[PDB]
Design a binder for this molecule. Sequence first.
Ligand SMILES: Nc1ncnc2c1ncn2[C@@H]1O[C@H](COP(=O)(O)OP(=O)(O)O)[C@@H](O)[C@H]1O
Ligand SMILES: [Mg+2]
Ligand SMILES: [Zn+2]
Ligand SMILES: [Zn+2]
Length: 572
Amino acid sequence: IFTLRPYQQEAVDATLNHFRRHKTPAVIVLPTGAGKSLVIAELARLARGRVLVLAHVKELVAQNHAKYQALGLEADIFAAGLKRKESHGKVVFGSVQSVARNLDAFQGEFSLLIVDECHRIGDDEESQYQQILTHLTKVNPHLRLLGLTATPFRLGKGWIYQFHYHGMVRGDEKALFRDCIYELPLRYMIKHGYLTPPERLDMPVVQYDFSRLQAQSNGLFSEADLNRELKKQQRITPHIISQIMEFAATRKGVMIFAATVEHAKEIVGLLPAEDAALITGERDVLIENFKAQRFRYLVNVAVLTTGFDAPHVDLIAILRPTESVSLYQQIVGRGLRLAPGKTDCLILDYAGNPHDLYAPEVGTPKGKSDNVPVQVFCPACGFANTFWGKTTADGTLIEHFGRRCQGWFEDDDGHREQCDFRFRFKNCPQCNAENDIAARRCRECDTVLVDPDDMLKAALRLKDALVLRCSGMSLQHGHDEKGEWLKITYYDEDGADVSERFRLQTPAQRTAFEQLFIRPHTRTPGIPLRWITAADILAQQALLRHPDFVVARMKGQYWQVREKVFDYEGRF
Ligand SMILES: Nc1ncnc2c1ncn2[C@@H]1O[C@H](COP(=O)(O)OP(=O)(O)O)[C@@H](O)[C@H]1O
Ligand SMILES: [Mg+2]
Ligand SMILES: [Zn+2]
Ligand SMILES: [Zn+2]
């Protein structure tokens, strides 16, 4: 009694093809509710020896075992508190702690290791995980390792894999997994009826202003920063909860996603007495009480409970800002389990989060809250990159902060490489090769690339050269006998200024202008500025930025601009 949905057969096929050509671990990205047990079952059926499904969380180990056996198949379990029964079946489910101390039971053939929730590996039970890995690779030197996760990306931690099979890089060489070989988007499950569809309320009455907040190192939000502005706007909290109650009269189950513990307890109070509970992050804490509708409301703070299956949840109310589209999708998905008569799950966002469940995950920290995902084509390979940026109403790009194309390619010989097109770069002083902005040594000639502070410090002390911190630039143009020209004047807050001039008459002059001024100064690298006359440059000065520092050699007529520091991070 097992036939595979098309997307499940695809995940199996992707795994077989990968390991028939490679030894390296790979990861599959599946959302909850996809039916991971069916993929495991068919992989085990085709396997030599046995298959081990390992998981850090013992609670998850027991669920996977349950769902697998519910397919009409047999398996062992190695979890704490359980006793070794008659070993039966081709699959073994276990936890990192239990397996790492019952390693004497794994002296047989294990051809495949499936690690569920593989995004946790860098967090906990790391010594024991190496213990399991060392033992399995000495018994099975050709063992294959498949990762499963619904959350490949975590803010502050990075991506779990480097190469995505659709043609883009996500992590760098430090990524735990070399490859993501299959991904099932949440959009596909909703579109094809594998999950209940969400329906977000378009116009909430009042919502929190969460734009002024500045993220910490991780890109996350501090509890204190969230609380500062929650208490600034706490006269809106009564009104938002009032409408949640109004919507809940037409719904069945209600989850509330609050920002802090201070915010939650306030929320529970405004809710009807005995009609609301709370989920921190002891036990089930009334998990099946909620599913028996002992209470209509269940508030939750930054704690995701693995395994929650509540088809009765008809309503999700998000009152916390979401730092990532991926976090928003894990929150929404908890109310998308199918049920008869459940036409949708109403989503009530009162935090000002964007209205796009299917937005692309940039995968890098935002920086400024007004930035949005923007699409930027690579001039070299044509890959459609997605960077942080800003647009007009029509969608016309104003700025984008991408630095390198994220595409990769692999040649017939099997050699793989990321696209080398660099939207932002620095030239090597010796060989002129284009290098990453952060590089300390040239990639082609290994010459030292001077830090911005050090070059400035030498010219700041040695005043034979001029140094100027730039607050902005002004543009001027005219027309002499050899043709048009454009003069740029760089100035500081105290009025000192350095100027440079570009002629614009000859083809070589125009080419040099684009090479030396536009492409460095442009706000949208990779999208050429269209221009005929110098006045066209002036009209489009919004698309240009000014350097943060200007260094000029105090020589020539008055000075000759030599260095320009863009995107400066350091002393000043
Ligand atoms: N090929 C299939 N045929 C019939 N039912 C399926 C199939 N694949 C998945 N399902 C059903 O879809 C649901 C998957 O939910 P769940 O087991 O929680 O997925 P996961 O374990 O990946 O979170 C289960 O109710 C399961 O019976
Ligand atoms: Mg399953
Ligand atoms: Zn490219
Ligand atoms: Zn060089």
